[PDB]
Symmetry: D2
Subunit: 309 residues, 4 copies
């Protein structure tokens, strides 16, 4: 009850990057340093194994290990929300119940993608997991190729476990929910400022907070600041020029907080974009980005692409 | 060597994306599955996709999926080409599923571009290059489900590999003709376009959902020349089958025809009663003798259907 | 630092895994069993050992159970994951995942069924000794391979080797304790003498699942051959058939676990369930876990599960 | 009634090889080396193969690897040899899934051991076997030295009432073998050094063999062409060498020395040391290289030629 309201009050949730060692196994030391940096800079929640976290590339044993690890090490200092959704109701059920048993505070649930279903199918799917604990519903039609229509959100909102919506359709859809008292986090970093201050969004579930968490906290807490929004836009444009998480993986390797190791099918942004990133870090100021090391361009041969992880 | 194996996939005109039927507790009905595959072979299907979108590969555990492929090869592999849907948005899953499927004697692989976790053009090529060397491969472009079009530049690059059999293309006849005019083999992924794709745009044939119901008629459409009459007669059935996302239609129809149990793995649920009545009417317009099974088509009561969450 | 905390423990319960009727874990019932162990002075739990039917678990349910136990109880009791395997690959992955989820220690058996050379055994243990505090498990009755003293003395030089769960007997326990190695008896009917006469730090116990208070008294309040004699009937009953057949049957009779068995374990037959009702009365039911009157149960009360 | 023919087709096999699983340098299966090992067995009179038994390191496989190897062997060789999947487990759930998957992919038979480590009661053991016995031709594996639990005759006699019980792989010895054969139960010896006397003096149908990995033609001779004490005595030094450390350490070392498998070990197995590899070269000379699998001169191999993999 207050578990769900504890999620509803979060303004800055980081969709945290999963860092890798050279053979593609998780780098738990790098991961811990990233989550600590997020806490120190006023991140209030983490999504573990979301799209930015490459949950789709995880075996389920890695994923529950990472949720349990994150609860064990950080559960007292940050809200841990497992991405335990799936296009398979069986996996969503299994993952969500194992997630809560290891003490995660919440679950992020997308509608079934690729294997898309009917409105009745979609409701049936969400009813199997909504009862298990506090739940953020994830609408990202650019990835799923299926819009969760307002009628479905309204019906799901009748359950008190439905904490709110991670919305990516845009600020009109955000406002359609917030004006009826439904909590919304923007999923679009380049819209979250206008979403928070003009459209009643509680805050952001952010990719950009992986690089500049202090600046993203400032954006959601310290009142409208279109000057700061405009200073971040070039970084946000760079981050989303290829599909997330290609930008943030490339960037965190340039900042030296993650090794230059990619699980396929992701590959780094090319040299031309890594040179652009150095200029963006200098223009914003290195002190605002995670890590202490000097940003590097890196050579192509620094990047390790792994298929057998 | 590989050239003959690839040419054996390229010659196929009718490939059925076969439905996976279930027991009351949500496990595979292998008995019902074997009868479906036998019915496809008897009515001219030359190939089968095992665990495609239509076969709910998305809902299988990998041990279930690999077993169904090995089972299809062992029982039917001398009588039909067995093409495993061993694709994934995860390169690691695609590598292991594909090498295991080929090691168990499947004739080909269907490989979609990474969906949901979509990647760059460079990433897409790197993904396909890990599996294209393993054997005859059909690249699957269905941007309506993946939300990412495989652009012609990826297809032209992959077609330099002799294991690249061809494309299952869902974008339309214009995209079909961009490949067939250069001699890249194309199967239509769209039942309501495949007649025109086949006779007017150089498509070799169809990777079909409708062939689950009327395999005889789909074979006739793909072999016996232009037949606008027969294509129009089927259009109402194809419109019924795709009014909700596949395979809700085919799953419902095969239970109504009595060739699979009315058992659904969530998040799929059957078409409602008024649609099942519509289906009985469509079966009578075309003729029950053209549909799979012998039992009279039934409407079925809402409570005849079982929905499984924990399969 | 971390290893010294494990070396002090005297009562470690090899905790039973209870099931719902479809064969899935009964986490409510599991949590109730662990809360009772803590209330009655149990200082550690083995999660998914032989008693816990680790061998019957899927990977994800074993790793989940360890993580669940750390999250719910890690502050009140030491959680030792049974992450050992006859496969080095499985021992590596389970041990590193167990420690990442915050378990305090790992229990490591020598490879069973696919048994290996002494050199192979040393190679196996070295892949996991570096990951955290490790108890080496010698149970030649189940592995059909005795870990020789030579191997234990060499491993004991590694500061991550906390000590040995030893089942060979009290002469073997003393050979290790007199040479400075920490030993827990793995034999409930030997652990008293082991503790008071042979230098054993305490017990990794099955019987503590039924009578955790009496087992704590047996390990802490001094030599007491009369209490030991009073428990010997219950211990002989618990080991008539291979563990965990006895403990699974008893906890069903006490009403703290459903009468649900994962094959290939089946319950003790009716004559033995009647003996257990008598042993409970002889000892006093207030000493046994749970509040319900001890039932005999019918043969048809027991659900045997193959597909779970 | 097809069940009867299928089970009888297993019962008539006299030479069954517990085939070694060979690896690439990173620990994955070497399917090329495996196909060459299986082709050699067929060319030299082996009539069946156990896929991923103890000798084949089934205990170290993930089930996706194991099921793949069964389907691969059925698909490439199923017409030329009988394929028996080791789909047994100390877990009844794993035994049921592995066995129904194995049969669904066309394996001819299943090898079922009694639960090891997590051992059960007589009643439990019967319950375990009854869940898989109905799926098809089944060989019950009694190996008390590895399981630490003898499958007692009362259990075997009860199981032999099922038409799908093809027979027993028995390791207790010739007196236990005779107990079963004198009652008409088909038995294969699982002890290479006993299988000659078991075959000709105690009514064993043949052998489920480790040694046939090295000298398949000699083992076929031992099982088909009558009593031959001299040939049996000449294989004994090789058979003692193969079992001085737990199987399959010996056969893994030997197949590397003969150059038919790469010198790659999945832990917890490690090669016999140099002194034993030098003995092996001597044993091969004594018998004749022509009788051992492969065409390459036998090598001693250096310690540093061996790769040990934990994270496979
Ligand atoms: Na996310
Ligand atoms: Na398909
Ligand atoms: Na234990
Ligand atoms: Na074997």
């Amino acid at each position: 009850r207050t578990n769900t309201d504890d999620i509803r009050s979060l303004r800055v949730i980081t969709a945290i990057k999963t860092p890798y060692l050279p053979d593609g196994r998780f780098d738990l030391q790098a991961y811990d340093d990233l989550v600590n940096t997020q806490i120190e800079n006023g991140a209030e929640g983490v999504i573990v194994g979301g799209t930015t976290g490459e949950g789709q590339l995880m075996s389920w044993d890695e994923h529950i290990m990472l949720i349990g690890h994150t609860v064990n090490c950080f559960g007292g200092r940050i809200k841990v929300i497992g991405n335990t959704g799936s296009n398979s109701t069986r996996e969503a059920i299994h993952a969500t119940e194992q997630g809560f048993a290891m003490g995660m505070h919440g679950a992020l649930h997308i509608n079934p993608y690729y294997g898309k279903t009917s409105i009745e199918g979609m409701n049936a799917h969400f009813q199997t997991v909504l009862h298990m604990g506090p739940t953020i519903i994830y609408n990202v039609p650019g990835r799923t190729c299926q819009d969760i229509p307002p009628q479905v959100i309204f019906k799901l909102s009748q359950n008190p476990n439905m904490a709110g919506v991670k919305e990516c359709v845009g600020n009109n859809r955000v406002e359609e929910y917030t004006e009826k008292g439904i909590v919304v986090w923007s999923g679009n970093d380049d819209q979250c400022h206008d979403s928070r201050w003009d459209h009643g969004a509680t805050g952001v579930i952010s990719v950009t907070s992986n690089l500049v968490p202090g600046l993203m906290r400032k954006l959601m807490f310290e009142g409208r600041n279109s000057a700061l929004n405009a200073k971040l836009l070039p970084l946000m444009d760079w981050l989303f020029q290829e599909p997330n998480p290609i930008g943030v993986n490339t960037a965190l390797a340039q900042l030296g907080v993650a090794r230059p190791v990619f699980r396929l099918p992701y590959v780094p942004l090319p040299l031309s974009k890594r040179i652009e990133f150095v200029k963006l870090v200098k223009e914003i100021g290195r002190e605002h980005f995670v890590g202490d090391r000097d940003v590097q361009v890196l050579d192509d041969d620094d990047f390790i692409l792994i298929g057998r992880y």
